[PDB]
Amino acid sequence: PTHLSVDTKFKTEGLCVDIPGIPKDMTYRRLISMMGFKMNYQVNGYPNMFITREEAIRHVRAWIGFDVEGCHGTNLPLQLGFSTGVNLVAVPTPLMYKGLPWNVVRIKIVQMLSDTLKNLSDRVVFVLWAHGFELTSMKYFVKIGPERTCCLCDRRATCFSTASDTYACWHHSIGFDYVYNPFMIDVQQWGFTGNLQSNHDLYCQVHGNAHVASCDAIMTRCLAVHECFVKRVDWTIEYPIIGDELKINAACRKVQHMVVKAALLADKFPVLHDIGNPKAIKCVPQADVEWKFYDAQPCSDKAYKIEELFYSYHSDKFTDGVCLFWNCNVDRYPANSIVCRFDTRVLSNLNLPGCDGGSLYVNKHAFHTPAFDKSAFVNLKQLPFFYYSDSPCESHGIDYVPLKSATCITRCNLGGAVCRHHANEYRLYLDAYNMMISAGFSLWVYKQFDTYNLWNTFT
Numbered sequence: 001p002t003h004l005s006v007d008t009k010f011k012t013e014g015l016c017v018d019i020p021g022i023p024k025d026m027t028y029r030r031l032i033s034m035m036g037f038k039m040n041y042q043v044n045g046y047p048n049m050f051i052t053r054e055e056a057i058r059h060v061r062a063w064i065g066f067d068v069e070g071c072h073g074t075n076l077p078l079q080l081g082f083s084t085g086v087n088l089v090a091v092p093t094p095l096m097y098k099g100l101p102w103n104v105v106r107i108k109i110v111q112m113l114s115d116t117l118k119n120l121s122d123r124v125v126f127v128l129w130a131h132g133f134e135l136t137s138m139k140y141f142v143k144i145g146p147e148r149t150c151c152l153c154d155r156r157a158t159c160f161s162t163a164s165d166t167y168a169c170w171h172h173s174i175g176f177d178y179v180y181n182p183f184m185i186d187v188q189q190w191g192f193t194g195n196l197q198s199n200h201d202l203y204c205q206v207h208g209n210a211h212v213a214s215c216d217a218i219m220t221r222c223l224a225v226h227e228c229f230v231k232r233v234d235w236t237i238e239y240p241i242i243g244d245e246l247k248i249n250a251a252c253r254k255v256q257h258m259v260v261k262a263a264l265l266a267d268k269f270p271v272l273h274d275i276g277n278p279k280a281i282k283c284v285p286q287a288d289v290e291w292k293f294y295d296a297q298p299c300s301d302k303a304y305k306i307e308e309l310f311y312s313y314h315s316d317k318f319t320d321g322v323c324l325f326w327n328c329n330v331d332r333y334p335a336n337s338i339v340c341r342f343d344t345r346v347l348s349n350l351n352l353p354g355c356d357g358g359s360l361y362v363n364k365h366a367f368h369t370p371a372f373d374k375s376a377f378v379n380l381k382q383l384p385f386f387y388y389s390d391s392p393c394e395s396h397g398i399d400y401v402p403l404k405s406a407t408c409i410t411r412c413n414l415g416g417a418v419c420r421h422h423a424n425e426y427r428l429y430l431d432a433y434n435m436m437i438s439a440g441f442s443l444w445v446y447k448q449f450d451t452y453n454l455w456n457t458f459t
């Protein structure tokens with residue numbers, strides 16, 4: 001049991017206004033046939049156009065919300081809306097395009113999906129709130145068959161070209177006109193009461209209803225993300241490497257060690273309250289400080305209220321020493337904090353649009369993160385870049401240009417001239433730092449933090 005059986009029942013109540021008289025008793029097998037597709041009893045990797053909720057979650061990077069509204073049924077124009085904000089008008093003869101025949105509309109669909117998905121996934125999952133016209137419009141831009149590979153590479157085929165009779169992945173599909181072997185899921189099958197807008201608006205105020213197909217496409221995908229990543233959370237699901245995941249994660253570990261070690265050296269806190277991941281390890285194992293851990297899983301819905309984390313009776317005195325909130329999203333950080341907070345607004349292949357201002361950050365695991373809020377940091381300041389090292393000035397074991405920098409906090413720089421080892425380490429650290437920042441992470445610190453206090457650790 002890994003794929004959705006074509007013999008599974010499909011509830012047709014949501015389809016009966018666009019498709020009156022539709023049988024109540026319906027399987028995916030009969031629905032696919034009604035949609036104009038023929039599966040021919042084929043054991044060639046594509047057993048069903050529709051997928052399970054579990055398969056959808058594993059392929060969240062492929063999710064594209066899709067809605068079709070009757071602009072005026074083979075006689076009337078249709079408005080095709082996608083969660084990319086694109087609206088296309090197809091004539092049978094928030095971007096809004098004028099009415100065009102299907103032969104040109106399909107070319108645009110292939111281009112749009114290929115540009116959106118080439119760096120995210122090997123497929124497309126059309127996320128629907130199915131009412132009928134979206135399912136019956138698929139025959140005009142979708143072709144199905146056995147699983148195939150690209151004509152220019154080893155990736156699976158996602159597009160087909162009627163001009164050349166060839167197949168391509170999202171990277172090699174320029175000029176292609178058909179979407180090939182797409183996947184889809186109807187959110188209405190999950191058991192909801194009431195329409196799309198009433199269910200979406202229970203959890204999100206950021207997506208409105210401008211009464212266009214793309215607005216519905218966006219709401220449908222948002223509702224699906226809420227159900228699968230906000231109200232339900234699964235950290236056992238692994239996702240493939242598609243970008244700088246490893247470098248970002250290594251950079252995060254380096255920056256955490258650097259910043260915490262320097263805060264302990266500069267202000268000599270007697271106790272550190274480490275709030276967050278219950279599997280956290282001391283990031284500065286050699287520090288003398290009394291290290292105390294507090295368990296809090298990553299919040300996926302709203303940011304934690306500092307009152308619930310700290311109060312209701314632990315050192316108890318979180319006001320003593322310093323608090324470390326490394327990716328532990330809270331409404332308002334205390335003044336004595338060291339913080340790393342993911343900025344949900346960041347544009348990247350790892351960060352997908354989410355629910356209610358939040359974003360779905362996918363790096364090995366999927367983490368829905370509450371919307372970034374500048375007011376959470378009112379008691380702190382932005383942590384400036386610096387590099388600190390107490391290691392001996394010794395090269396050991398890549399060419400050189402001497403380093404001159406006021407932020408290279410080392411014995412050699414204090415002495416007037418940065419050594420080769422600390423210049424190499426400073427540059428590697430600055431690269432790791434910029435990688436983590438560009439990935440969306442923001443760093444905040446207690447207002448008294450001053451790197452000038454680090455120079456006297458060299459005596």
Ligand SMILES: CN[C@@H]1CCN(c2ccccc2F)C1=O
Nearest residue numbers: 261262264265284286287288289
């Ligand atoms: C006497 N206290 C020692 C001095 C060095 N130190 C320390 C070392 C590495 C990282 C952070 C630190 F605070 C202490 O805790």
Ligand SMILES: [Zn+2]
Nearest residue numbers: 150153169172
């Ligand atoms: Zn290819």
Ligand SMILES: [Zn+2]
Nearest residue numbers: 204207222356
């Ligand atoms: Zn929404």
Ligand SMILES: [Zn+2]
Nearest residue numbers: 393412419422
């Ligand atoms: Zn040095």
